[PDB]
Structure 1
């Protein structure tokens, strides 16, 4: 009963990758997205900066928000980013859509889940 056709498609793609490729994060993210919006992740930069590390893609099974400061040069992949978040992140790293992540790494390797 999701309404967003896009969110719906992302979820189907996340599965196709988790099944075909050896990914497990993708299937993991898919299940959380299938869950009620209220349980989805709403992460600010402060937390990403605190537990992320370079050369390890940050995966947010939700949306990323721009509160706080991010200095580490990391690649963050989320369902969506507030405009401020995506601006602060591209200043020191790279903001990426989950759909790109699934394509540049269907194996879901070297990835860290943050929520």
Structure 2
């Protein structure tokens, strides 16, 4: 039982997209968000840099933290970003909320899941 109304709503949106549109990553991310918070992702920039690529949205089924350097001009989609992470990302690319990525890409295409 999640307690955050925003997380609950987000999870429901993710589902709605996964079902309606042909997206399968949203329903996948939704299943991780339903799982215990401790299992959620906590990824620092150093990893997003090592495995991401341009024109491929990096999807973090958790939260992004500001440790390390990010140079690639990538679009990062997460549940939340540490104030530093968001700052460091918008410097070389773009940080986006999962709620936006669901609207901009309900088909969940050209996306890389990172944790």
Q: In structure 1, how many angstroms separate the alpha carbons of the residues matched to 2:22 and 2:42? A: 27
CA deviation string 1:43-67 (max 9, x = no partner): 0000000000000000000000000
> Aligned-pair distance for 1:111?
0.2
Question: Secondary structure at the residue paired with 2:50?
Answer: helix
CA deviation string 1:74-107 (max 9, x = no partner): 0000000000000000000000000000000000
CA deviation string 1:3-44 (max 9, x = no partner): 000000000000000000000000000000000000000000
Segments of structure 1 that go 5 or more residues without pairing to the other structure are: none
Question: Secondary structure at the residue paired with 1:49?
Answer: helix
Q: Normalising to structure 1: TM-score of the pair?
A: 1.00
Q: Normalising to structure 2: TM-score of the pair?
A: 1.00
Q: Which aligned runs of 4 or more in structure 1 are off by greater than 3 angstroms?
A: none
Where do 1:25-104 residues align within 5 Å?
25-104=25-104
How many pairs are equivalent? 115
